[PDB]
Structure formats: C-alpha cells, structure tokens
Amino acid sequence: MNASEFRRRGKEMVDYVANYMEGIEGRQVYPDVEPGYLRPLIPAAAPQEPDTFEDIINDVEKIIMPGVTHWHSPYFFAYFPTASSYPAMLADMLCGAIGCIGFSWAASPACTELETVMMDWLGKMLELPKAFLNEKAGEGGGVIQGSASEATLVALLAARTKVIHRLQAASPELTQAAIMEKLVAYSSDQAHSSVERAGLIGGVKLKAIPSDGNFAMRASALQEALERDKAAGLIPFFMVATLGTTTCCSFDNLLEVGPICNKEDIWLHVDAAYAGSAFICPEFRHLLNGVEFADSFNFNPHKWLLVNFDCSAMWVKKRTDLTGAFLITDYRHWQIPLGRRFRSLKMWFVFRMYGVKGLQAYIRKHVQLSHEFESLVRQDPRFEICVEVILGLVCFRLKGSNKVNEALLQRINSAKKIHLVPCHLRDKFVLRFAICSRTVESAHVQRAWEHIKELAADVLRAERE
Amino acid sequence: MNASEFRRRGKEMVDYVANYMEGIEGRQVYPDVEPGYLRPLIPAAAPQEPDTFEDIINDVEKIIMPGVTHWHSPYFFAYFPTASSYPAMLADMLCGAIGCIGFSWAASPACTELETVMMDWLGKMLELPKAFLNEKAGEGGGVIQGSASEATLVALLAARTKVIHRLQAASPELTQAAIMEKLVAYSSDQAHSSVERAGLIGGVKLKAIPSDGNFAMRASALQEALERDKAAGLIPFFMVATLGTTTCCSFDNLLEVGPICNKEDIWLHVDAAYAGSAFICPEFRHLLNGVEFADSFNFNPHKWLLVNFDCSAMWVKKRTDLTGAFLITDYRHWQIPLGRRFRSLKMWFVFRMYGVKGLQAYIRKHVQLSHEFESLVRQDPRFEICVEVILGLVCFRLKGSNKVNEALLQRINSAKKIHLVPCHLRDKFVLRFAICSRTVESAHVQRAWEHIKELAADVLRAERE
Ligand SMILES: *Cc1c(COP(=O)(O)O)cnc(C)c1O
Ligand SMILES: *Cc1c(COP(=O)(O)O)cnc(C)c1O
C-alpha cells in the first residue's frame, strides 16, 4: 500500500469511524457471543495473496463488532470511563505517521521535549506543588507511563532501590536479599490489584490497611499496622494511597497518612488513576490536599481526561530517585520498557482543542449526571447508597441479602440493555453505577434507572416467594 | 469536537500524513535542534479557550517537525527498522475508535480472541513447533506484549516464580529471599540492555556468557560459566539467547545452548526482536533451529514486520508457567500491565493487506539491499567487515584505530545527510549500517556509501597528518 491508496482508504476509515460513533446508541452495549466464537469465523492461516480492504471492513462489521463491548456507548456504566476524543484520535494518526521510538533524545528530540512540557501543563492544571513540575530547574518532573498499574510498579521499584541503598549504607555487610524478606509495602484494603501485582513483581510483602467507615485509610489504622509490623522485624518502605478507589471511589486521607509516611521514611505513592482528572476543577482540588507529602503522584488521562489509551501521567519529587530504578533528555529509567511512542501529541491536541474550560465542563457534566442517578436511587427506599457520592460513581444496592443483589445484577447484564459491574464492601455485595461515555446525557441515566427499577421488582418478587 | 467535525479534520489529517510520507526524502533525517529547544516555542500553560486545528497543524510543521528524527526516511540507517505501514495505520484508527480496554474477556471478547488467532497465524508463518501455538487444545500459546524488553522481563518473572516454587518444594523451610541471592540469569555478552534491566527489576544476578569469534553464544562457554557458578553456590534459572543481536546481528547457537538449558532446568527465553521477522522466509528459517528447546520465544512485528509500534509477539510452551508470574480468555497474567488495547487489529490488517508473500518480498528486498551495501564496502580495502552479513545489518569500519572510526562517525552525523550509529565489538569501535525504511531503494544505499566513502577520505587525511 502506497500513500495514494492511503489517501483513499484513510478517508474511508475516517467515515467508518464517524459512522460507528454517530450510531453507537443503536449498538447492544454488551455482546451475546460466548468464549471461542471468533476462531471458527476466520481462516486458520494468513492469506498468501492479499485480501481487499472491502473484505476486511466487511469482516469488522460481520465478525469483530458482534464480539465488541462498546465502552463508549452511553449505556456503558461499568468499571470506570476510558478516554475517547477526536483530538486524541487525530494526534494518534500523526503519532503513527512520525513513527519514532523515543528511547533516547536523539531518537526524536520532540518526542521527549513535548512530553515534559505537557506534564508541566497538566501539573499546573491540577495545581500540583511546584516540587513535582520540571519547569524552572526543579529537581522534580513528570513522565507519561503506559498505565497506572505500570506507574505503581515503577514507584515501588524506585522505593525498593532507595531503601536497599539506605539500609546497606547503615550496614555495609547487609545483602540485598536479607533486606528483601523484611521489606513490607502498604495499601488500602480498597486498593486496586495493581498494588498486589507490583509487590509480587518487586518481590516484597504487601499488607492491607483496614479502611474506616467511609472506606478511607486513616492515621490510626496505619499507626496500628506500623506498630505491629515494626515489632515483628518488618521494614515499611512503600505505601500506595488511593484517591478514588476502584471499589467505591473513596479517598485515603493524605493529610493524615502523608506526615506519617514522611517521618517513617516510607515512599508515598498516590494512586489517583480515575479521580485525578477531576482535580483540575477548583471545587474538587481539596480532595488532593496532602499530595505535597507524596513522593510520587499518578493519574490516568486515558480514563477521565479524554486522552485515548495509553496515557498515564506520573510525577516525582526527585528524578534521581526514579532513575535509580531501571534538562530532561531521556525517559529510559522512568519506565519499565525502553521504547516509547509520541504519546504527548495526544495530550497536546486534547488540551489545545478542548481548552482547560472545555475539560472542566466535561468533568462537571459527568459528576452532575452521577448526582442525578444518586438522586433517583435516594427516592426509592428499597435501595440504599453505601458510600458518599463525590465523583462519577454511585455505589448502591437493594436493602437485604447479597443473594437478592447478585440476582438483580444477573438480570441487568442478561438483558444487555445497560452494562455495570459490582464490588464487595466488607462482606456486602454492592452494585456500581459509573458515568463513562463522553456522549452520555440525562436521558440515558434516567432510562438506565428505570430499567434497574423494573428488574429489581421482578427480583424482589422471586425472593419473598 | 463531534463526529461531523472529525469527518472533516480526520480526512485533512489523512492528507497531511500522506503528504509527509510522499515528501519524506526532502526532510533532513536527523535534526539540528539542541536539547531544550521546544519549551521556549510554546506557551507555559494550557489554553483556557480552545485553539484551532489550523493553529495546531501549523505548529506541527513549524515547531514539532524540526525536532523530529525521521525514522522512515530512506536515509535513516540507525539502530534497527521500526514498522510503518498504512494497513497498520488504518487498523490503529479503528482500534482507537472501538476504544476498549481488554483487561478481561468481558471487557471486549474480540479484543482477546483475535489476538490469539493472530498469534497462531504468525506462529505458523514462522513454522514454530506446535507446542507454541494455541490452536488444537495445545498447552502453549502466544500473546502480544508492549515490547521485547517487557517480554524478556515477563519470561524472567515466570522463570523466577517457577524456580522458587521448585526450590521450596524440595526444601519447605527455604524462604523466597534465601533463594533470591543464589539465583543467577545468563545472556550473551552481546545481549540487549533489556536483559540487564529485567535482572535488576526481578532482583536476581545476571552474568554475561563470552561470545565466540562470530559473537555467538556456544556450548563450551556456557558450560564453563555453569561449572564456575554452580561451584560458587549460584543457582542458574534463566537464560536469554539472542537471535540477531543488537550489536552486530549475530546468532546464539540454540542447537547447543538449548539442550544444556533443558538438562540444567534453566528457563530458555529466545530474544529475536529484530531477526524474528525474517524467519517467515524459508531460506532464513534455519537460523531459528533449536527453538523447540526454548520455553519462550519473542520477536517484534513492530521492528521488521510492518506492524506499527506497539506490537511484540511472545509465545510460551506452558501458559500455566506464564500465569504464575503476575480457551484463552484473559491476558492479565501474561503481561506487566492489566489494561491493553485492540492491538491485534494491526496484525490482522497487515497480514491480510500484504499477504504472506508480500511480507516475504519486503524482508528479501531489505536483505538484498543489505548485501548491496556490503558489496560496496568489500570493494574498498580501506574498510573491513567485522561480522558476517546475514540480514539487514552491516558492521564495518576503517582499518586502523578506533579514533579514526570515531572521527568518521562524527563527520557522518554532523553532515546530517544520513544517520547511523556505532557499536563496540570487544575493544573495537565499529560502525553499523541498518536497512530501515519501508521505501528504501538501491539508489539510497548507493548514495549513502558514496557519502561515507567521501568523508572517510577526509578523515584518513587528517590522521596521517
Ligand atoms: C483504573 C485504575 C487502575 C488501573 O490503571 P490502568 O491504567 O488500567 O493500569 C489502578 N488504580 C485505580 C485506582 C484505578 O482506578
Ligand atoms: C530492539 C531490540 C530489543 C528491544 O526491544 P523493544 O521492543 O524496543 O523493547 C531487545 N532485543 C533485541 C535483540 C532488539 O533488537
């Protein structure tokens, strides 16, 4: 394929993408296929001679789309939003066209320099402490990571290297392994599974801090764990505090946990993968208070800031600590892989084509829609809200047994009109309602609640009986 | 931005991308900017109100392009090729449009099922042993990784988990840490830096095996290292054998190293990140002989098989060993991150729009151009070829001191007409000539050699004098 043919097919793909987005409300949000549906529908071997673009696009509609879960359907209310905007799509096309692998400054200077400036743009939009920004010769700085899960692993590896060096400085005869079986990392009992995966990769123990009634990490529970583990010979070295937990969008108390981590010499990493995008709005910035005590901070523009995956933004106070784990000219020692693509183009395009006010309006509309769903639930005494509604998530359930709530969820996902997922809060089975699609409106939320209300009546009938 | 506006701007971006590719030979391949050039040229903060698409695209030409190293210029001869094809670009546009995060089967069934079938397509194109393919209920299988560096880390973590479990089964009182300071991994002295990074992340020792006269790992050097380290109390557990080393495109001997790794219970990972694409051609498949002894095999379609980054293909013999490190319905335990995008669409589009024969012709043209450059060097007795030319890489130098070769390289990269990078073979400073661009032709290679020949005369003058 040459560029002349790409001129034709590329514009045809633009129309196909726009057609799919304009009719996405006509798609069943969750598929009806079963595992293994795809292999019988395509050949067992690659074609020796080429297929036509018409044949391929037909297969996308006939064979791929039936097995697609439409994350950007307005009726997708599962997990958390993922980003989809046309400015990011346009930058992605340019990113693949330039096609550089910026493992070094020389590999493409703009690939590294634009990223550093965009991380300062974003840091200033969130009003981060100046110690996190790279501008003005500061020792801190920011990098794009592939994911928040990778960002958490990177912070743990930097913390592990730092504590090993400190411990061996105090005791030069101490081996890295003898240190290894004493290190312990901490996170909330509401922490994302990325923390457990990072502890396993890094080869250190991980313990969960019990959350309070609001599912937040507090000073008293942390001090109680430190007292026990330090007496047992464990060495606390790393902490993941979460702002906007995956379970119920709760918030660990940084003003309490921060000073404790500092005095204990515990590397404090803040996981705000979903909630972080809201901190560009002044009415939510107070939820970030205490980040000045953190050693690293991370959130996902590819969740709630319209920058298509992959784009996770991570800042650190000391870049030298980051480079220990394997003005800013190179990002090799900031990430797990060595290669990387021109991902900052997506941030640049999104920030410029929306503006700060356009992004703020997008956040506030989603939070407003969240409170609209919460208001509907609060009008039905058969239901209860389990956690305070702050951002684009509502955790609710039928009053009574978990069995009746497991049955309501099964009916919802069986009808395949809307899609949501549950969680477990202590021993309580809880349903989640997450505002996800960029194009979701009040009408979609209202229809979703009517569907939930109807199915709950059928479920409540079947259990009394 | 709505879909109607994307219809206009998306087609405008298609024309901009096609224009850039059609005029890429008019671009200076390596930039003249210095580190820090970008920040003074764009504002210090994001715009509050949106900018226009016209303003942004103008900034791409005025401000971004001067700091771009054009990897797809025909005169880019550095490192190794990276993939850029229009079928992959078209699939990338669709990938971002579907916009699913396939961390689970339910997150989008097609995102996982197409990947498994495409890895069987690719495995059959390389004529891998059936134990690596997923088709027909085999215990093996393949996954797309973000990079070969990440693929090497994943194999090391699986090997580490497996040997820890085996050692603790034989000695139940043995701690994971006591095992940790005895584990040792191996690689060639020509190994990519990804291996050293994986050893540091995994927390294990890494030793280099001395290469032979052809810079290949051999049985005798491996047996000598095993004899020394086993006597010292180290426990060999992981080996990275390289097919197509980054330094000189040498090949470790799998027929010798494979059986040794098997009998020593050493997990054998084969790193063929660049060379692997050539193994779809029958005349090169013999270079892969011995992969039947490997526990995991990896190569990069995003290097030499026209599938735009990111796309690294990894196969394993036992998926259960892979899932230990944190029919095929989930890929969470095959990779470092949890989230992932619909990357298999790029493989599907490239394989179908080119066909196996189209990809074979692309490989053979590059190798033919490599031998054309080698032939020119072999006509000049002032130069020498240091390693046998097999694929798209030629390692050459002026006969004499390293200083005269360091000077020739500095003149080449200072003239900014072509771009290449050097290596070190033992104590010898060596220049690399890599066939990279998809659109490179004989005329480009011939002009590059004339440039090198001219600058070598100037350099040889300045040193005798
Ligand atoms: C989504 C989420 C993650 C996962 O991040 P990815 O970028 O998908 O790896 C981690 N932590 C929290 C709190 C999240 O919401
Ligand atoms: C390029 C290369 C790598 C690097 O792989 P990435 O996908 O860039 O991480 C590793 N090993 C070899 C042999 C390579 O050629």
From TrEMBL, chains A, B:
<dbReference type="InterPro" id="IPR002129">
    <property type="entry name" value="PyrdxlP-dep_de-COase"/>
</dbReference>
<dbReference type="GO" id="GO:0004058">
    <property type="term" value="F:aromatic-L-amino-acid decarboxylase activity"/>
</dbReference>
<dbReference type="InterPro" id="IPR015421">
    <property type="entry name" value="PyrdxlP-dep_Trfase_major"/>
</dbReference>
<dbReference type="GO" id="GO:0006520">
    <property type="term" value="P:amino acid metabolic process"/>
</dbReference>
<comment type="similarity">
    <text>Belongs to the group II decarboxylase family.</text>
</comment>
<dbReference type="InterPro" id="IPR010977">
    <property type="entry name" value="Aromatic_deC"/>
</dbReference>
<dbReference type="InterPro" id="IPR015422">
    <property type="entry name" value="PyrdxlP-dep_Trfase_small"/>
</dbReference>
<dbReference type="GO" id="GO:0019752">
    <property type="term" value="P:carboxylic acid metabolic process"/>
</dbReference>
<comment type="pathway">
    <text>Catecholamine biosynthesis; dopamine biosynthesis; dopamine from L-tyrosine: step 2/2.</text>
</comment>
<protein>
    <recommendedName>
        <fullName>Aromatic-L-amino-acid decarboxylase</fullName>
        <ecNumber>4.1.1.28</ecNumber>
    </recommendedName>
</protein>
<dbReference type="InterPro" id="IPR021115">
    <property type="entry name" value="Pyridoxal-P_BS"/>
</dbReference>
<dbReference type="GO" id="GO:0042423">
    <property type="term" value="P:catecholamine biosynthetic process"/>
</dbReference>
<keyword id="KW-0663">Pyridoxal phosphate</keyword>
<dbReference type="GO" id="GO:0030170">
    <property type="term" value="F:pyridoxal phosphate binding"/>
</dbReference>
<comment type="subunit">
    <text>Homodimer.</text>
</comment>
<feature type="modified residue" description="N6-(pyridoxal phosphate)lysine">
    <location>
        <position position="303"/>
    </location>
</feature>
<keyword id="KW-0210">Decarboxylase</keyword>
<dbReference type="InterPro" id="IPR015424">
    <property type="entry name" value="PyrdxlP-dep_Trfase"/>
</dbReference>
<dbReference type="Pfam" id="PF00282">
    <property type="entry name" value="Pyridoxal_deC"/>
</dbReference>
<keyword id="KW-0456">Lyase</keyword>
<keyword id="KW-0127">Catecholamine biosynthesis</keyword>
